[PDB]
Design an enzyme around this catalytic site. Structure first.
Site, PDB file in Angstrom:
ATOM      1  CB  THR B 149       5.277   2.150   4.756  1.00  0.00           C
ATOM      2  OG1 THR B 149       5.028   2.072   3.363  1.00  0.00           O
ATOM      3  CG2 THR B 149       6.269   1.026   5.111  1.00  0.00           C
ATOM      4  NE  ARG B 177      13.157  -3.170  10.167  1.00  0.00           N
ATOM      5  CZ  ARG B 177      12.108  -2.869   9.409  1.00  0.00           C
ATOM      6  NH1 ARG B 177      11.415  -1.740   9.619  1.00  0.00           N
ATOM      7  NH2 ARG B 177      11.739  -3.705   8.439  1.00  0.00           N
ATOM      8  CB  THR B 200       3.816  -0.703   1.573  1.00  0.00           C
ATOM      9  OG1 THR B 200       3.535  -1.087   2.928  1.00  0.00           O
ATOM     10  CG2 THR B 200       2.830  -1.442   0.695  1.00  0.00           C
ATOM     11  N   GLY B 201       5.618  -3.170   2.391  1.00  0.00           N
ATOM     12  CA  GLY B 201       5.742  -4.620   2.534  1.00  0.00           C
ATOM     13  C   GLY B 201       6.922  -5.009   3.392  1.00  0.00           C
ATOM     14  CG  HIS B 202       9.981  -8.676   4.487  1.00  0.00           C
ATOM     15  ND1 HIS B 202      11.137  -9.191   3.945  1.00  0.00           N
ATOM     16  CD2 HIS B 202      10.141  -8.719   5.833  1.00  0.00           C
ATOM     17  CE1 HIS B 202      11.953  -9.560   4.918  1.00  0.00           C
ATOM     18  NE2 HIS B 202      11.373  -9.283   6.075  1.00  0.00           N
ATOM     19  N   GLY B 203      10.265  -4.940   4.614  1.00  0.00           N
ATOM     20  CA  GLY B 203      11.262  -3.864   4.373  1.00  0.00           C
ATOM     21  C   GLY B 203      12.658  -4.342   3.969  1.00  0.00           C
TER      22      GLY B 203
END
Ligand code: NA
Ligand code: NA
Lengths: 295, 290
Positions: B149, B177, B200-203
């Site tokens: 993001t 999604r 930010t990263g794996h949502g």
């Protein structure tokens, strides 16, 4: 082995209404507790209890949901597994009988936690779920409320299963006259609910925007987890802060990882019922709590 | 009157990316130096990152399973906990600017899909052709599957905090999604009593642990530095779920940090005449503001 606990809540009262609402929460809680007594999961039991409250037209979720600005029903739901923090959620769902059952399928059958709108409808079709006519969700009481608003809360459940797992589920039609595509707290992990085997599980109801802004479900548990507080005190603090910081009123149900439970609210009323051991507890206001033998 | 701070991040050719975060943080910091709000400044920074085709947000967003762009964004004002968010937005150049209008112009905090498009229309925002948000690198990445993001946090001269987050999501994602970026407490959080975060990263992981509010929970039970709070919040996500990502954080007193557990995270910060920037644990630079 843990003694299982199931708690439910409705939202936020034509006396023949009070009694049906009360009966509805007792029915949904006893149903979810039956699942736990048969060895089913905390997740299985919250899904069952919340789907019953969706099917009950007296509650603002599924059938009986409040109407949007367009006279339409748009629903939000979420479910969480406290063992692995598994979660599923759906927002702005239309023409689906049981949004909480779709949320559980998001959790179990996809690598995602949250689907919205047409995407959630497509996935429902891929799961073999049928759309139903929109007007079947609409009641005449809700049409009237809509006209009044142009000059109710959520439903939820928490459980602790015989293996020590906790779960929440939450489902709602939203707020009457809401803008098309408004998303409230009920599908948002942390706010409409939260479940973690290391602490407990919570499901919330009330002013969704305030609930979102303070992450109320997760807040109640932060209070529980840092110690020196019972489930009652943790819930009063979390609801205390929402009220004092934002003037936002609402309610919550909470079950700890050791099976202590509470239903608290700063609104005027919150239908609730709980089952543990051989007793069913229920009420709506401060003064009308009853306890009866389960059967 | 406090010394103001602005931090930005990207997600997870390296010179263009580094120039982007620096340009974005300087743009947002200029707003604060002119006396604009923390909210003003985070909006402006994220909108710059949205416009920059090198970042997965706005122009340059990754593609869905149908080769389409769907975007999420959120913003929060730590003064009164005001918040706005949008999800699954299509054909809009600046999702964060729509999120801010949700916060300021409606009694609601979150709109999705066709309802969010209708509100954009009510506000006078045009839809743009969808292909304009699509780059060739992203048509390419979508083939291969058969970036994170962007964010900012700010502390302003009157001591107010705010975050903004915006994203295109994950490549080849399921239609509709929703990730962590539009969800308050997860994509970010801001409260004057503590600080602001953007993530930010794996949502899905970030959602399950509510990463942004978690960082602040660690910060507020005092005697902890912003660095420590970030590592704890991030360490819990990695250990509990094997989820990687990063965050930026600024406290109500002006201390700030950029931390990550992924391999990299573009970031920049501007405070007292200085611009700090990086991508890896190594390549941090500090230069004077001109
Ligand atoms: Na119902
Ligand atoms: Na961009």
């Amino acid at each position: 082995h843990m003694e299982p606990v199931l708690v439910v809540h409705g939202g936020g009262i034509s006396c023949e209404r009070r009694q049906r609402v009360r009966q509805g929460v007792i029915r949904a809680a006893s149903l979810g507790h039956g699942v736990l007594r048969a060895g089913g999961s905390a997740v299985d039991a919250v899904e069952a209890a919340v789907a019953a409250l969706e099917d009950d037209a007296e509650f603002n979720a599924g059938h009986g949901s409040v109407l949007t600005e367009n006279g339409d029903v748009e629903m939000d739901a979420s479910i969480m597994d406290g063992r692995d923090l598994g979660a599923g959620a759906v927002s702005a769902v239309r023409c689906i009988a049981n949004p909480i059952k779709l949320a559980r399928l998001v959790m179990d059958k996809t690598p995602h936690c949250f689907l919205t709108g047409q995407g959630a409808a497509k996935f429902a079709a891929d799961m073999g779920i049928s759309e139903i006519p929109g007007e079947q969700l609409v009641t005449e009481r809700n049409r009237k409320r809509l006209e009044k608003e142009r000059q109710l809360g959520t439903v939820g459940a928490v459980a602790l299963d015989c293996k020590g797992n906790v779960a929440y589920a939450t489902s709602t039609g939203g707020i009457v006259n809401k803008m098309t595509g408004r998303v409230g707290d009920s599908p948002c992990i942390g706010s409409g609910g939260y479940a973690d085997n290391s602490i407990g599980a919570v499901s919330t109801t009330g002013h969704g925007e305030s609930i979102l802004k303070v992450n109320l479900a997760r807040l109640a548990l932060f209070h529980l987890e840092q110690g020196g507080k019972t489930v009652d005190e943790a819930a009063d603090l979390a609801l205390g802060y929402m009220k004092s910081r934002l003037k936002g009123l609402g309610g919550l149900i909470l079950v700890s990882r050791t099976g202590e439970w509470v239903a608290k609210w700063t609104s005027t009323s919150m239908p609730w019922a709980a089952v543990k051991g051989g007793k069913v507890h229920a009420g709506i206001d401060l003064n009308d709590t009853t306890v009866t033998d389960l059967c």
